[PDB]
Ligand binder design. Structure first.
Ligand SMILES: CCCCCCCCCCCCCCCC(=O)OC[C@H](COP(=O)(O)OC[C@@H](O)COC(=O)[C@@H](N)CCCCN)OC(=O)CCCCCCCCCCCCCCC
Ligand SMILES: CCCCCCCCCCCCCCCC(=O)OC[C@H](COP(=O)(O)OC[C@@H](O)COC(=O)[C@@H](N)CCCCN)OC(=O)CCCCCCCCCCCCCCC
Ligand SMILES: CCCCCCCCCCCCCCCCCC(=O)O[C@@H](COC(=O)CCCCCCCCCCCCCCC)COP(=O)(O)OC[C@H](O)CO
Ligand SMILES: CCCCCCCCCCCCCCCCCC(=O)O[C@@H](COC(=O)CCCCCCCCCCCCCCC)COP(=O)(O)OC[C@H](O)CO
Ligand SMILES: CCCCCCCCCCCCCCCC(=O)OC[C@H](COP(=O)(O)OC[C@@H](O)CO)OC(=O)CCCCCCCCCCCCCCC
Ligand SMILES: CCCCCCCCCCCCCCCC(=O)OC[C@H](COP(=O)(O)OC[C@@H](O)CO)OC(=O)CCCCCCCCCCCCCCC
Lengths: 793, 793
C-alpha cells in the first residue's frame, strides 16, 4: 500500500511497533545468557552456514527472475546482466531499508532511467514487483498455513481450526480478487485498485515468489539446529514473520520478524539457538548480499564492465550498507568484552558515537554528499583501529574494512558538496536512528540483566542527534533571468516576469530555476533554463537548497531529456500529460490533413478578423478594453482565478510580451499572449481568451493566425498548450495504483481545459511531447501534485 | 511414454507388476483381520468422508483447468461447459482405465472430433496434457520430497540423505530439460523428444497440476485417521504412489498404489486404518466421479442440453464404470457373510461369474455392441436381486442400481449388432481380466487366512474366459465394385481393378471398403465409396469384420469429412499429408499466377509433344513399348517395385482405364494413367512416367495436357498426387511425440516423391486437402504405418 501513507504518524507508528516488538523480545528472552548465544554462534556447523549461503544465492536468483519477469510483462525486453545487477542490488537494499531514498522504488528508478526505460514504465515494474511480493507472500503463507495448522498450531497453543480458518479467509479473499480481475476489470478493494495481469503471468510470478520465500525460509531453517518442526512448519512461520515484518514498514523488518520467530519457536526449541540463528540469519541474508553487490561494482570499476549502472547504484548501496554497519557498531559497542581500551563505562561510548555518526553519514551518502564521504570514511577508519585492538573479530573487522575499501574506491564517483547536518529530517531516517537507538537500549537491558553511564550516554547522544536533526527576488535578478530567457532556448519560461516565483541562479550566472512554495515543500515551474552544461550542476543545487530549509523539491512539466540526470538527484518522475508541439517547417495550410483548419480560418475570413503585433510599450491604447474582456472571461468560468498557470490581470506582465488580438474589425474583443525568445529557436503561447463575439466556429482563428505568424517569423516549432493524458494511456497502467494516479488524471482534466481539450489541440495535428513532474525524497505525488494545485489556486 | 510400448510383453509385464504388488500387499498385511477393516469403514467420521468429497471436487475442478489450459495453448478457444464435461469424463475414465479404448486418449478423440477440433490438434491436447501430468507430478513429488526426507525418511528406515538426493537428481534432470527447451529446441531425451511450451504456460500448468495432486492427496489424507505424519509428508508419499501406479500402466494404478502406501504407512499407523482408507479412497475418488459423470449425461438426456457430446461419451463412461462394478462384484462375492443363498462353497460362484461376465460386457460396451447391452443389463439385474436379498448394502445396491438405471436410459443410444465374444483380444482387456482375477485371488488368500472350491471355481471361470477369448474376391464382386465406382463420386477408388485388395460390401449393395492385410491387422485404401447414407453403417461393419478375425482396422488417406463418424468407431486419426486438388472452373492458363505452366507448356509446343485419349480396348498397339518404357522407369529407381500405390506391369489394369501418352511425335516414350468416374463429378491420375526423352524442362507437359483435358471434359476438380507435410506443419507439433511422428514424416518424404515433390505439386497452384490414416484400438501408428509400408513394399 505505497503512496497511501501521508503523514509523520506513520514514522511514529513504525517505531512504536518496533518498540512493542523489542519489548516482546526482551519479554520472551528472559532466561537466556548472552554468553550462551556467543557459544551457539561459535559452534554452528560450518556446513550449515555454507548451506545458508547456497539458499541465499538461490533466493537472489529468484529475485533476479522477479524483475526479469516484470520486464517481460510490459514488453520492454532488456539485456540480462543489466537486470541481474539492478535487482540483486535492489533487494540487497530493499531487504535492509524501506525508506524514501533507500527502497526498491528509488533504486529501480535510478537504475532504469539510466538503463533505458520510461518513467511511466518504471512505475509499472515497481508496482508489479510489489504486488508480486505482497500478494504472492500472502497466497504462499495462506497456503502453507492451510496444510499445517497442526505442526505449528499447538506451538503457540492456538487450536488448529482457527489458524487454518484465517488461512481459508486469506485464500478466499485472494481468490475473490483474482476472480474479480479475470479479464482487465480494475477491482477497487479500497484506496488501492488492483488490476491483476494475465493468468499466464501471475502464475509464473507466483512460482518465482514461492521459490523466493522458500529459499529465504530455508536460509533460517538450515541455521536453526534440529527443530521439533519440519521444513514446511517453519515455512509457515517464516511467511507470517516476513508477512508482518514487511507489513509494519520497519527497516529490514527487524523487530517484528525477530519477535514473531522468538514468540513462535521459544516454546519449541531453546531460545539461545533461535537468537543465534536469527543473528546469523540477518548477517548471511541481509549483509552478504550487500557485500556481494558492492564488490561486483567495485571490482568491475577497478578492472564485463557496467560502470554507468554501478555509478548510479553505488551511493544507494553504500548508504544501505553503512546503516547495517552502524547497527553492528552500536550493537557490538554495547555488548561487552573484559579487556577494553580505557582511553579517557564511558570508553566504549566513542564506538557507539562512531556508529551513530556513520548512520548519519549514511543519510548523507544516499543524498551523495562530500562531507558524507569524509565522515563515513574517517569514522569507519576510527572504528577500524579502535575495534581491531580488542580482538581479531574477522566478521566485524573484515566487513568494516570492506566498507573502507569500497568507500575509498568510490571517491571519484562523487564530489558533490553540501552540509551534512543542515538537512532537517525525512520520515524514514528518523525511524532508522530511532530503531538503532531502541534496539541498542534493548541490547543493553538484555545483556547486563544477568551480571548505566553508558546507557545514559547513548541516550544523550541520540537526543543530541535529534536536536541537531531539528537543526520576490530583486528586479536585477528578474531582469537578468529575462536576459537568460532571451539568450537561450525554450520559450516556455516566459512566465518569468509575472513575479510570485523566487528565482535562484547558478555560479555561471546563465542558468536559473524558478521556485514556488506552498506547503512543506517548494516546487518548480518548467525546467532549468540555459545551456546544457549548466543544467546538471544546477539540478542538484536546487534540491540542496530545498533540503537546506527542510522542504521537498517537487518539479512540474519537465522534459524527457532532463530525466538522465534528473533521476540521479533522487527524483521519482511521474507522467503528467503531453505538450502539443507543432513543427513549422513541416507544416502546410491544408496539405492533406489540415483543411479543417483552412475552412475554420475561412469562417473568420468572411468576418475579416484581424490581429496585433504590438510591442512591450504598446499598452495605453488597449488596457481598459483588456479590463472589460478580462471581466468577460472571468464571467466565463464564473469568477475563479488561478496562479502558476497563466497571466492574470497584470499592468506589466500583460503588456510585457508581444500579444495578439481578436478584433471587432479594430475594436478589441479577445487577445492572446505570445511568448518568444531572442534566439528565434522556439516560440509559444499560454492563454486563449473568450469573447461574447466568438462562437464555437471561431475558437480557432485567434490562435490560427498566431500559428501562421510564428511560422512567418521563422521558428522551428511551437509549444501550444499542454493536454491531459489520453484514455489509451489511462489503460496502460500498473496494478497497485490508488487515488494518486486517479488524481493525476483528475488534475489533468481539471486544470488543462482552460485553454482547450485534447481533441482541441489535436485539431492542429500536433506531434506530442510528454512532460513529467519530478518528486524528491520518495514521497507521494498525491502530496506533490496538491502542493502544485494549491499554488495554482 | 505413449506410442513406444509395441508389444504383448507390456501386457504381460503389467500384470507381472500387479502380481508382485498384490503379493507385497498380502506380505505387508499379515496381522490384520477383515472384520477389523469392516469396523474401520463402519466407523469413519462422516465429516471426513464429506471432506473427501470436497477435495475430490477440487481435484476434478483442477482437471477441468488442465484441459482448458491445454485448449488455450493451441489457440483453439472452445466454450467451457463443453470442456468441463469432456475432462470431468476423461479423468473419470483415465483414473480408472489405461487401455486402448478406455484412456484419456480415446475419450479426448471421441469428445473433440464431435466438438470441433482437428485431429492434428487433439494429438496436441492429449500430448500436452500427458506431459503436464507426468512432468508436473515428477516435479511436484521431487520438490515435496526435497523439503522432507525426514518426516517420511525413517518411516521406511531409509536415511534422509538418500531420499533427498534422488529428489535432487529428479529436479536436476527436469531443470536440465527445461533449460534445454528454453526457446523451441526439441530436446531428444531418448525415444521421446520433448519440446516444452512457453515459460508462461508450463508455469500455469504447474499450478494446475500441483493443485490437482494436492487435492488428490488430501482425499486420502482426510481418510487416514490421525497419522504420525503431517499433510506434506503424506503428500510426498502420495506423489510417489501415484508416480509409480501410473508408471506401471496398471488399470487405475491399482496394485502399485496400494502396495506403496501399505509399505510406507504400516510402519507408522495401523494397517487396518490404511486399508479402510484406501478402499474408501478408491470409492470416493474413482467411482463417485464416474457416477457424477454418468448422471450429468443421463439427467441432461432425460430433460443446458449437451446430448451430442453425451452420445459420444456415454459408451466410454459406461464401459469404464462396468469394469469397477465388476471389480466390486468379484471382491464382494469373495468376501463372506454368514447368511448366504445356497441356491444349488459354490453358491456365491454365481456372483463372481456375473462380475466377470459384466467386465467382458464392459469390453463389449466400449466397442458399443448390442449383446453387450443385453448381457450387461441382465447380468447387473441378476446381481441386483441376488445381492439385495442378503443385506441392505447401500453402496453395492445403489451403485449397481445406478448402473442399471443408466444402461436402461442409454438403450436408444446404441443398437449396433456384433458378436460379444468373437473379438479375440486386446493388449489391455487381458490386463483388466487378469487384474480382477489376481486381485480376487489375493482377496481370497487375505480373508480366509484367519478362519477352496470357490477359489478353484473362480480360477476355472477365469481360464474359461481366457479360452473363450482365444475363441482376391470374385470377378463379379470386382466388376460390381467398378460399377459402384462408376455410379458414384470420388475417383480415387479407380485402383479397384488391380486386384490384391479384398473388397467387402454393404447390405445396400452400393458401398464398399477395400481391404489389404499385412501383419496382425488389415488396412484400407481410400475411403468407403458410395452415397453418404451407406458410409457410417459400413464404417462400423469394417471394424467389426476386422475384430472378427482378430485384427486391427487401420485406414489410409481418409477424408476430413469422414472424421465425424470415423472417430466414433474408435479410430485415432493421424495427419499424413495433403492431397493436391485443383478446381477446374476456377482455372486459367496463365491468369496472373499460372504463366510458369504456360512457358513450360510452350517448351513442349516447339517439340510438338502429343497425347492419347485411348480406350479400355486400345491395348495391342502400345503394349511392348509399354514394357520397354516400364524397364526404363524401373531403371530410374534402379529396380524396386511398390504395391498399394500405383499400377504395376499389368496386362489388364494398365489398359483398363483410359491412359494418355508422351510421344516421339507418334512413338510412345512415356505414358500416364487417367482415372475418371461415370458421374463426371471428379477425376484423377496416379502415375507419372519418366523417359530418356524428357528432361527437367518436360516433367510437366505430359501432365499439363491431362489437366487441360480434364478441364475439357468438364470436371469439377482434380486429385493430383498427394504430398508430404510441409515444414511449417512439422513445426506445429506436440511435446511428447517420438519416433512415431518422425517416421510419419519419413514415410511422407519416402513414398510421396515417386510422382513429385511438394513444390512440384505447388507448380500447378493447388488448393490443398488433408488426408488422414485412422487407427483402430488405440495402438501406435508406428505399427499401423509400417503395416501400410510393408504392404506397399
Ligand atoms: C496483524 C494484522 C494485520 C493484517 C492486515 C493486513 C493488511 C494488508 C494490507 C497491505 C498493506 C501493505 C503495506 C506494505 C507496503 C510496503 O512496505 O511496500 C510494499 C512491500 C515491499 O515490497 P519490497 O519490494 O520492498 O520487498 C520486500 C522484501 O524485501 C521483504 O524484505 C524482508 O522483510 C526480508 N527480511 C525477507 C525477504 C523475503 C524474500 N525476499 O511489498 C508488499 O506489498 C507488502 C505486503 C505484504 C503482505 C503480507 C500479508 C500478511 C502475510 C501473512 C500470510 C497469511 C498468514 C496469516 C497468519 C496470521
Ligand atoms: C522404480 C523406478 C522406475 C523409475 C523410472 C522413471 C522413468 C519415467 C519414464 C516415463 C514413462 C511414463 C510412461 C507412462 C505413460 C502413460 O501411461 O500415459 C501417460 C500418463 C497418463 O496420464 P493420464 O492422462 O492418463 O492421467 C493419469 C492420472 O489419471 C493417474 O491416475 C491415477 O493414478 C489416480 N489414482 C491418481 C490421480 C492423480 C491426480 N489426478 O502420464 C504420464 O506421463 C505418466 C508419467 C508419470 C511419471 C512419474 C515419475 C515418478 C514420480 C516420482 C516423483 C519423484 C520421487 C522419487 C522417489 C522414488
Ligand atoms: C507447503 C509448501 C508451499 C509451497 C512452497 C513449495 C516450495 C518448494 C521449493 C523449495 C526449493 C528449495 C528447497 C530448500 C529445502 C531445504 C531442505 C533442507 O532442510 O536442507 C537439508 C539438506 O540440504 C541439502 O543437502 C542440499 C539441498 C539443496 C537444495 C537445492 C534446491 C534445488 C532444487 C530447487 C527447485 C527449483 C529448481 C531451479 C532452481 C533455481 C539440510 O537440513 P538439515 O538436515 O541440516 O536439517 C536439520 C536441522 O534443521 C538443522 O539444519
Ligand atoms: C511441499 C508442497 C509442494 C507443493 C504443494 C502445495 C499445494 C498446496 C495447495 C493445497 C490446496 C488444498 C489444501 C488441502 C489441505 C487439507 C488440509 C486438511 O488436512 O483438512 C483438515 C481440515 O480441513 C478443513 O477444515 C477445510 C479445508 C478446506 C480447504 C479448501 C482449499 C481452498 C483453498 C485452495 C487454494 C486454491 C484456491 C482456488 C481453489 C480452486 C482436516 O484434517 P484433520 O484435522 O481431519 O486431520 C487429522 C487426520 O488426518 C484425520 O483427518
Ligand atoms: C503450489 C501451488 C499449488 C496450488 C496453486 C493454486 C492456484 C491454481 C491456479 C489455477 C489457474 O491458474 O487457473 C486460472 C484461473 C483464472 O483464469 P482466467 O480464466 O481468469 O484466465 C483468463 C485470462 O487470464 C487468460 O489470459 O484462476 C482462478 O480461477 C482463481 C485461482 C486463485 C488461486 C489462489 C491464489 C493463487 C496465487 C495468486 C497469486 C497472485 C500473484 C499476483 C502477481 C501479479
Ligand atoms: C511451489 C513452487 C515453488 C518453486 C517453483 C520452482 C520453479 C521456478 C520457476 C522460475 C521460472 O519460471 O523461470 C523461468 C526459467 C526459464 O525461463 P526462460 O528464460 O526459458 O523463458 C523464456 C521463454 O520461455 C519466455 O516465453 O525457468 C528455469 O530457468 C528452469 C526452472 C526449472 C524449475 C524446476 C521445474 C519446475 C516445474 C517444471 C514443470 C514442467 C511442466 C511442463 C508442462 C508442459
Amino acid at each position: 500500500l505505497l503512496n497511501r501513507y501521508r503523514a509523520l504518524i506513520v514514522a511514529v507508528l513504525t517505531v512504536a511497533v518496533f518498540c512493542i516488538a523489542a519489548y516482546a523480545i526482551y519479554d520472551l528472552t528472559t532466561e537466556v545468557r548472552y554468553d550462551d548465544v556467543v557459544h551457539a554462534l561459535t559452534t554452528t556447523k560450518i556446513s550449515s552456514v555454507l548451506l545458508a549461503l547456497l539458499f541465499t544465492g538461490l533466493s537472489f536468483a529468484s529475485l533476479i527472475f522477479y524483475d526479469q519477469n516484470a520486464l517481460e510483462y510490459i514488453g520492454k525486453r532488456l539485456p540480462f546482466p543489466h537486470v541481474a545487477l539492478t535487482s540483486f542490488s535492489a533487494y540487497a537494499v530493499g531487504n535492509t531499508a524501506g525508506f524514501g531514498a533507500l527502497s526498491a522504488g528509488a533504486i529501480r528508478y535510478r537504475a532504469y532511467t539510466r538503463l533505458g526505460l520510461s518513467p511511466d514504465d518504471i512505475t509499472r515494474v515497481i508496482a508489479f514487483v510489489t504486488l508480486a511480493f505482497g500478494l504472492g507472500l500472502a497466497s504462499v503463507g495462506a497456503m502453507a498455513l492451510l496444510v499445517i495448522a497442526d505442526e505449528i498450531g499447538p506451538l503457540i497453543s492456538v487450536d488448529g481450526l482457527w489458524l487454518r480458518l484465517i488461512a481459508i479467509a486469506i485464500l478466499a479473499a485472494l481468490a475473490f480478487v483474482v476472480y474479480a480481475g479475470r479479464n482487465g476489470r480494475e477491482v477497487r478493494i479500497g484506496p488501492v485498485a488492483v488490476r491483476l495481469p494475465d493468468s499466464r503471468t501471475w502464475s509464473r510470478q507466483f512460482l518465482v515468489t514461492a521459490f523466493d520465500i522458500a529459499a529465504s525460509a530455508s536460509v533460517l531453517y538450515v541455521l536453526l539446529p534440529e527443530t521439533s518442526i519440519g521444513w514446511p512448519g517453519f515455512f509457515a512461520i517464516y511467511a507470517i514473520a516476513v508477512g508482518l515484518g514487511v507489513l509494519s514498514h520497519v527497516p529490514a523488518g527487524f523487530g517484528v520478524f525477530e519477535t514473531i520467530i522468538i514468540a513462535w519457536l521459544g516454546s519449541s526449541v531453546n531460545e539461545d539457538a533461535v537468537l543465534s540463528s536469527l543473528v546469523l540469519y540477518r548477517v548471511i541474508y541481509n549483509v552478504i548480499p550487500l557485500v556481494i553487490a558492492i564488490a561486483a561494482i567495485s571490482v568491475a570499476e577497478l578492472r564485463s564492465s557496467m560502470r554507468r549502472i554501478g555509478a548510479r547504484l553505488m551511493p544507494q548501496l553504500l548508504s544501505a550498507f553503512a546503516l547495517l554497519l552502524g547497527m553492528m557498531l552500536v550493537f557490538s559497542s554495547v555488548t561487552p568484552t573484559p579487556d577494553h581500551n580505557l582511553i579517557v563505562e564511558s570508553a566504549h561510548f566513542l564506538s557507539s558515537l562512531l556508529g551513530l555518526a556513520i548512520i548519519v553519514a549514511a543519510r548523507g551518502l544516499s543524498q551523495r554528499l562530500d562531507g558524507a564521504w569524509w565522515v563515513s570514511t574517517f569514522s569507519a577508519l576510527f572504528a577500524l583501529f579502535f575495534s581491531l585492538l580488542k580482538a581479531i573479530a574477522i566478521v566485524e573487522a573484515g566487513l568494516l574494512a570492506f566498507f573502507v575499501f569500497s568507500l575509498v574506491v568510490s571517491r571519484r564517483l562523487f564530489k558533490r558538496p553540501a552540509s551534512l547536518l543542515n538537512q532537517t529530517l525525512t520520515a524514514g531516517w528518523l525511524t532508522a536512528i530511532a530503531v538503532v537507538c531502541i534496539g541498542a537500549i534493548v541490547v543493553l537491558f538484555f545483556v547486563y540483566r544477568d551480571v548505566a553511564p553508558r546507557g545514559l550516554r547513548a541516550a544523550l547522544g541520540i537526543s543530541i542527534v535529534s536536536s541537531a536533526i531539528a537543526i520576490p527576488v530583486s528586479d536585477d535578478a528578474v531582469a537578468r533571468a529575462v536576459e537568460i530567457v532571451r539568450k537561450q532556448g525554450v520559450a516556455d519560461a516566459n512566465l518569468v516576469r509575472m513575479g510570485d516565483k523566487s528565482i535562484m541562479f547558478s555560479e555561471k550566472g546563465d542558468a536559473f530555476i524558478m521556485y514556488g512554495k506552498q506547503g512543506r515543500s517548494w516546487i518548480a515551474l518548467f525546467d532549468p533554463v540555459g545551456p546544457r552544461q549548466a543544467l546538471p550542476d544546477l539540478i542538484w543545487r536546487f534540491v540542496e537548497t530545498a533540503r537546506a530549509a527542510g522542504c521537498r523539491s517537487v518539479f512540474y512539466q519537465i522534459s524527457p531529456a532532463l530525466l538522465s540526470y534528473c533521476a540521479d538527484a533522487g527524483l521519482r518522475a511521474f507522467k503528467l500529460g503531453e505538450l502539443a508541439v507543432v513543427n513549422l517547417a513541416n507544416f502546410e495550410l491544408k496539405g492533406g490533413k489540415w483543411a479543417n483548419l483552412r475552412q475554420t480560418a475561412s469562417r473568420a475570413v468572411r468576418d475579416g478578423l484581424e490581429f496585433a503585433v504590438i510591442e512591450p510599450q504598446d499598452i495605453p491604447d488597449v488596457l481598459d478594453q483588456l479590463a472589460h474582456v478580462s471581466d468577460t472571461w472571468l464571467a466565463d468560468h464564473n469568477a475563479k482565478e488561478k496562479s502558476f498557470s497563466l497571466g492574470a490581470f497584470d499592468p506589466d506582465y500583460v503588456c510585457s510580451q508581444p500579444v495578439g488580438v481578436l478584433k471587432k474589425d479594430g475594436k478589441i474583443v479577445a487577445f492572446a499572449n505570445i511568448l518568444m525568445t531572442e534566439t528565434k529557436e522556439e516560440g509559444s503561447v499560454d492563454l486563449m481568451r473568450f469573447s461574447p463575439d466568438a462562437p464555437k466556429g471561431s475558437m480557432d482563428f485567434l490562435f490560427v493566425q498566431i500559428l501562421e505568424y510564428l511560422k512567418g517569423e521563422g521558428f522551428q516549432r511551437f509549444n501550444l498548450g499542454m493536454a491531459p493524458l489520453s484514455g489509451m494511456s489511462r489503460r496502460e497502467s500498473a496494478p497497485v495504483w490508488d487515488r494518486v494516479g486517479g488524481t493525476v488524471f483528475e488534475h489533468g482534466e481539471r486544470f488543462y481545459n482552460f485553454k482547450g481539450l485534447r481533441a482541441f489541440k489535436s485539431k492542429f495535428h500536433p506531434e506530442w511531447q510528454p512532460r513529467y513532474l519530478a518528486v524528491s525524497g520518495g514521497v507521494s505525488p498525491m502530496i506533490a501534485l496538491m502542493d502544485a494545485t494549491f499554488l495554482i489556486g
